Structures are given as C-alpha cells and as structure tokens.
Structure 1
Amino acid sequence: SWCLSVHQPWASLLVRGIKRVEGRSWYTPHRGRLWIAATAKKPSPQEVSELQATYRLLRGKDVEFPNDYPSGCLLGCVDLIDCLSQKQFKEQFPDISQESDSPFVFICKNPQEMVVKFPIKGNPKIWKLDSKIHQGAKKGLM
C-alpha cells in the first residue's frame, strides 16, 4: 500500500530498473513492495536528455528509456529490500555506490512499470495509497 513520490525523470528510471537506488536524508524500516509516484514537478527536456546520456554511459549504449516521463501519477513499484547508510552502501554495493551520496540509500529490486498510469497527489516520505487506486494498480500489474 505504501508509496514514495520521486521527481521525474528519476521516477520512471526507477520503475524501469535503470536507476537502481534512491537516496534520501532519512531512514525507513519499510521493506517489501514500495509503489513509485512521480511528483508534479515537470523536468525540462534538457535534464531528461542529459540524464539519459549519463545512464547510457552507466548501463550501455542501447538501454531502453521510456518514451515519456509523466508527472503527477502512479508509475509502478519496486521491492525495497534494504535502506542503507551511505557507509553501508559503499561496503555492500561498490559497483554502484557512486550513484548516490545521500545519507540513506534505498536499495530497489524487481521493478515493475504500469502500462496504465493513474493521476495522483503525493506526500513527503512514505505515504499510503488510497484503497481504490491501490486496487487498480495491482490489477494493472498482470
């Protein structure tokens, strides 16, 4: 039921598995499925292309980006398998530890993207999806 709002384009890169971690100033004990919502903040076409170029260098020339990075909607989910301090992140994930310098690093696995994305208004930190949109999101995930 629990959701994290993330700015685009990083939001969609997370549910595509291209971005593998998300950094925050705070810790969460939450483990398991974590829904990902894009914030309302639209990214300029410039930062989308620059971030895409960067992730091409990190992941390979032919990585498949989403066609769009829609704002203000529920995108999909990840499994939040750990929430690591920066020190723990460097010890356990040396190959990607450069990808976040935040005090706490959310380690995400098993991303899933919704083919139909639903408009939504987010909140800070981990917040709870409303039942109706949560039910429709799980149905979409077939």
Structure 2
Amino acid sequence: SWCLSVHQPWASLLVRGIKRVEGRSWYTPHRGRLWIAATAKKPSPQEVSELQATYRLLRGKDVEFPNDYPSGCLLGCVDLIDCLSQKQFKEQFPDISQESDSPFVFICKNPQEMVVKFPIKGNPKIWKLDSKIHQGAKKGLM
C-alpha cells in the first residue's frame, strides 16, 4: 500500500528492472513491496534517448525498453529488499555501485508492471496509496 514517486524515464526503468537501484538522500526502514508512480514531470525526448543509450551499454545491446514513459501515473512496483548507505552499497554491490552515488540506495528486486496505468498525484518520500487505486493496482498485476 506504499508508494514512491520517481521522475521518468527512470520510473519506468525501475518497474522494468533495467534500473536496479534508486538513490535518495534519506533513509527508509520500509521493506517489501513498494509501488512506483511517475511524477508529473515529463522527460524530453533527448532525455529518453540519451538515457536509453546508457542502459544499453550497461545492460546489453538488445535490452527491451518500454515504448512509452508516461507521467503522473501508477506504473507498477518493486520489492525494496534493503536501504543501504553509500558505504554499504559500495561493499555489497561492487558491480553496480557506480549506478548511484546517493547517500542512501534502495535495492530493488522483482519489478512488476501494470499493463493499465492509473492517473495519480504523488507526495514526497514514501506515501500511502488510497485503497481504491490500491485494489485496482493489485488486480492489474495478474
């Protein structure tokens, strides 16, 4: 029932599993499922292509990117299995630690996409989904 808002294109990269970590300045004790919502900020087409070029390099030439990066909507979820400090991040994930220099790094597993994405208005940090949109989001994960 808990959500984090992320700017696109990184938000959809999170729910596809291409982006494996999110960095923030603040810690959370939250573990488990964490819905991912796209903020209202639309990314430029330059921003999308440049960033996709980077993740092709990091992940593989033929990595499959979403056709679209929608704003202001509930995208899917991850399981937040740990919230590591930069120092903990460098010692536990040496092969990906360059992918976030943030003070706190959210380690994500099991990315899931909803095929139908629902409009939503977010809040800072980890915020609670309303029950109506939570129930549809769960049904959207079938």
- TM-score range (shorter-chain normalised) is over 0.9
| Cα distance between partner residues in 2 of 1:110 and 1:12 | 14
Q: Taking structure 1 as the reference length, what is the TM-score of the superposition?
A: 1.00
| Cα distance between partner residues in 2 of 1:45 and 1:114 | 23
| Cα distance between partner residues in 2 of 1:122 and 1:92 | 31
| Cα distance between partner residues in 2 of 1:18 and 1:25 | 22
Task: Give the gaps of 5 or more residues in structure 1.
Answer: none
Q: CA deviation at 1:87?
A: 0.1
What is the aligned residue count? 142
| Cα distance between partner residues in 2 of 1:127 and 1:26 | 14
Indicate the SS of the match to 1:88. Answer: helix
Q: CA deviation at 1:81?
A: 0.1
Q: CA deviation at 1:65?
A: 0.1
Indicate the SS of the match to 1:78. Answer: strand
Task: Provide Cα deviations, 1:16-59, integer angstroms capped at 9, x if missing partner.
Answer: 00000000000000000000000000000001000000000000
| Cα distance between partner residues in 2 of 1:117 and 1:42 | 16
| Cα distance between partner residues in 2 of 1:83 and 1:89 | 9
Task: Provide Cα deviations, 1:95-127, integer angstroms capped at 9, x if missing partner.
Answer: 000000000000000000000000000000000
Q: CA deviation at 1:7?
A: 0.1
Indicate the SS of the match to 1:30. Answer: coil
| Cα distance between partner residues in 1 of 2:141 and 2:68 | 19
| Cα distance between partner residues in 1 of 2:127 and 2:7 | 15
| Cα distance between partner residues in 1 of 2:14 and 2:38 | 10
Q: CA deviation at 1:64?
A: 0.1
Match of residue 51 from structure 1:
51
Q: CA deviation at 1:2?
A: 0.2
Match of residue 7 from structure 1:
7
Task: Give the gaps of 5 or more residues in structure 2.
Answer: none
2:1 counterpart of 1:22: no
| Cα distance between partner residues in 1 of 2:21 and 2:80 | 9
Q: Taking structure 2 as the reference length, what is the TM-score of the superposition?
A: 1.00
RMSD of Structure 2 on Structure 1 (CA): 0.2
User: Identity of counterpart residues, as a percentage?
Assistant: 100
Indicate the SS of the match to 1:107. Answer: strand
| Cα distance between partner residues in 2 of 1:49 and 1:85 | 30
Q: CA deviation at 1:9?
A: 0.1
Task: Provide Cα deviations, 1:54-84, integer angstroms capped at 9, x if missing partner.
Answer: 0000000000000000000000000000000
Q: Which runs of structure 1 show a deviation greater than 6 angstroms over 4 or more consecutive aligned residues?
A: none
Indicate the SS of the match to 1:67. Answer: coil
